[PDB]
Amino acid sequence: GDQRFGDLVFRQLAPNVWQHTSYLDMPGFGAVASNGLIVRDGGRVLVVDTAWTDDQTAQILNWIKQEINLPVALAVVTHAHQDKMGGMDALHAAGIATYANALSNQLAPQEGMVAAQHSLTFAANGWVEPATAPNFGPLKVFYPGPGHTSDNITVGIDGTDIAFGGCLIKDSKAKSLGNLGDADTEHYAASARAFGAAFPKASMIVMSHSAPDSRAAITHTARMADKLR
Ligand SMILES: [O-]
Ligand SMILES: [Zn+2]
Ligand SMILES: [Zn+2]
């Protein structure tokens, strides 16, 4: 069941995996939810995405202290928008090692974000170059191609049936692809399909702006993106 913790919501998805949710009252649209992940790997915790703000991200760390009570070894953030990187300063204040796509770190300042400490780079096939993602444990990082943004990355969780599409993927009942302001409309569909192909055994797809869904999230997202081309 959902756990309200201050202004955030936490939901256990699997034995060692929780979803964090935070909200930003954005004038013109409404109060927009964004989801990320928290993963326990043995005696440490790994975070995927910040909350929208530093204050909210500090609350994620407070929840982790209360409910898990193990050190956060690292965080990976999945592109240079506020929902994913808005809380970088809070992570740094906590002494957490941070990672993002090299391109996300490059784009961060102009997007109003603080860059992560470390840059991930990717092979031609999309898989992270392993030397750039040291000690990632069960986190398997994949660049699916440009879509929601040029820099969007995705994360599978080994030992689970979960893959995280971030803002690239919307659920199977979504009416649109959300914020396309920085999108690559020509490549979106192929990138969504590449995410699915990278994590073919994932049965639970987690994403930024929908609740967890089946792989129908991937097929529906790609089919909607076929219209963008
Ligand atoms: O986003
Ligand atoms: Zn975004
Ligand atoms: Zn987003």
Curated annotation (Swiss-Prot):
One of its GO terms (biological process) is antibiotic catabolic process. It is an enzyme of class 3 (hydrolase). Substrate binds at K170, N179. It is found in: Periplasm. Its EC number is 3.5.2.6. The keyword Zinc applies. One of its GO terms (molecular function) is zinc ion binding. Inhibits by captopril, thiorphan, dimercaprol and tiopronin. This enzyme is not susceptible to inactivation by the beta-lactamase-blocking agents clavulanic acid. Zn(2+) 2 binds at D83, C167, H209. It comes from the Bacteria. Zn(2+) 1 binds at H79, H81, H148. Binds 2 Zn(2+) ions per subunit. It catalyses: a beta-lactam + H2O = a substituted beta-amino acid. Its cofactor is Zn(2+). GO terms for cellular component: periplasmic space. Keywords: Antibiotic resistance, Hydrolase, Metal-binding, Periplasm, Plasmid, Signal, Zinc. Confers resistance to the different beta-lactams antibiotics (penicillin, cephalosporin and carbapenem) via the hydrolysis of the beta-lactam ring. Does not confer resistance to the polymixin colistin or the fluoroquinolone ciprofloxacin. Enterobacteriaceae carrying this gene (identified by PCR) have been isolated in Sweden, India, Pakistan, Bangladesh, England, Scotland, Northern Ireland, Australia and the USA. The organisms they were identified in were K.pneumoniae, Enterobacter cloacae, E.coli, Proteus spp, Citrobacter freundii, Morganella morganii, Providencia spp and Klebsille oxytoca. In India most isolates were from community-acquired infections rather than hospital-acquired infections, indicating the gene is widespread in the environment. Belongs to the metallo-beta-lactamase superfamily. Class-B beta-lactamase family. This is Metallo-beta-lactamase type 2. It comes from Klebsiella pneumoniae.
